[PDB]
Each structure stands twice: as structure tokens, then as C-alpha cells.
Amino acid sequence: KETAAAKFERQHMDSSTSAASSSNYCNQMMKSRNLTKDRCKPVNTFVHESLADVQAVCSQKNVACKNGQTNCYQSYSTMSITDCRETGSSKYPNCAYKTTQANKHIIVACEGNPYVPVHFDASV
């Protein structure tokens, strides 16, 4: 089945764009990445950086995850991110999301060999 590392890339990477380009980004992306298949994932962050710059955070600042886990890392630098949050108009199967574009530091949980990101914890 899909690895946790490949699931991270499918849910959270969008190297192909520098920022979300319209208020429709999120509905388009959330859909095409298969995130609205069984239900509407409520919150999801997209990261508009290179995969290597995102994999490198697993060697930057070590911070506790929100849940208390010790395998989280905060990026030394701000990154271009898009947060997608479900709207009051959202009704499965028609998920509807609000697109917010920002530059913030990200916090991911890493695991494995090579040690790469497996979960997006937060943006700061």
C-alpha cells in the first residue's frame, strides 16, 4: 500500500506552483489529490517548495509535536504554504474549502531510513 512518506507528498506537496493562484485552488487540489474521497478532510496544508527543501526540515529544529511526540522539526525558514479549510457550504461529496496563502515556518513529523516527513503538524 502507499507509504507514509508517499502519502505526505500526495497530501502536502505542490512544487509546481509558487503560491495558490485563485480562491478555487483548494477545491481543485483537495479533489485531485483524492482527499475528498471517503469524506471531506477538514484541514489540509499544501507546501510550494522543493521536495528536498521540505525533506531537509528533518534535520532542522527539533520541537515536540502538538500531541507530545519528540519526532517533530520546525523549518529554520518561512515557506510559501496554502491552508485549505472546509467552508460552511461544504457537503460531502461536494467538499468546499477556503484557500489561505501564507509564508510561515512549518512543523512536520519524520520517520524512517532515509528519515523524511510523514505528517504535517502545524505552520508557525
Domains recognised in the chain with CATH numbers: 1-124 (3.10.130.10)
* Residue 96 to residue 36: CA distance in whole angstroms: 10
- 91 annotated ligand-binding residue: no
| Residue 5 to residues 23, 24, 48, 51, 94, Cα–Cα distance (Å) | 28, 27, 17, 11, 28
Which sign does the torsion angle of CA 60, 64, 70, 72 carry? negative
Active-site position among 8, 9, 12, 40: 12
Backbone angles phi, psi at 5, to 5 degrees: -65, -40
Q: For 93, what's the count of Cα atoms within 13 Å in the CB-facing half-sphere?
A: 4
C-alpha cell read off for 59: 534535520
- 7 annotated ligand-binding residue: yes
Of the candidates 75, 15, 11, 77, the one whose C-alpha atom is nearest the C-alpha of residue 43 is 11
DSSP H or E run through 10: helix 4-12
- 12 as an active site residue: the answer is yes
* Residue 106 to residue 48: CA distance in whole angstroms: 12
- 66 annotated ligand-binding residue: yes
